[PDB]
Design a protein around this ligand. Structure first.
Ligand SMILES: [Zn+2]
Ligand SMILES: [Zn+2]
Length: 132
C-alpha cells in the first residue's frame, strides 16, 4: 500500500503490456509503449529518491546501485527499440524486437529487486527507533 510498491507495480504492468503486444506491432505502436515504461520508471526513481531520507544510512548505497541498474536497463531497452525501428520491414525486425523484450524483462526483474532492497531497509528501520 506504499507509493514505492505502487510505482513498481505500475512499471511492471507497462512492461507486461508491451510484452504481450510487441510481436505484431509497428514502431508507431511500440514507441509509445516504451514511452510509458520510461515515465513509470522515472516516476519510481523519483519516489525512491524521496524515500531514502527515511531509510538507514547503511542501506543508502545498495538502494542507489539498484536505481542505477534500472536506469541502464531503460537505456538498453531504448537502444534495442531504436534498432528495431531502423530494421523495420526487414528480417532483423524480429531479432531486435526480441531484444527489446529481453531488455524490458530485465527492467521488470530489477524493479522487483529494488522493491526487495527497500523492503529490507524498511525492516531494518524498525529495529532502530528510541523511547517516547
Ligand atoms: Zn499501460
Ligand atoms: Zn507518545
Amino acid at each position: 500500500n506504499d507509493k514505492v510498491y505502487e510505482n513498481v507495480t505500475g512499471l511492471v504492468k507497462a512492461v507486461i503490456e508491451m510484452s504481450s503486444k510487441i510481436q505484431p506491432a509497428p514502431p508507431e505502436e511500440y514507441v509509445p509503449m516504451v514511452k510509458e515504461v520510461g515515465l513509470a520508471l522515472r516516476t519510481l526513481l523519483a519516489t525512491v529518491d524521496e524515500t531514502i531520507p527515511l531509510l538507514p544510512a547503511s542501506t543508502h548505497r545498495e538502494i542507489e546501485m539498484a536505481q542505477k541498474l534500472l536506469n541502464s536497463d531503460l537505456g538498453e531497452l531504448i537502444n534495442k527499440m531504436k534498432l528495431a525501428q531502423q530494421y523495420v520491414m526487414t528480417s532483423l525486425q524480429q531479432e531486435y524486437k526480441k531484444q527489446m523484450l529481453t531488455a524490458a524483462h530485465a527492467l521488470a526483474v530489477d524493479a522487483k529487486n529494488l522493491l526487495d532492497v527497500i523492503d529490507q531497509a524498511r525492516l531494518k528501520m524498525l529495529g532502530q527507533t528510541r523511547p517516547h
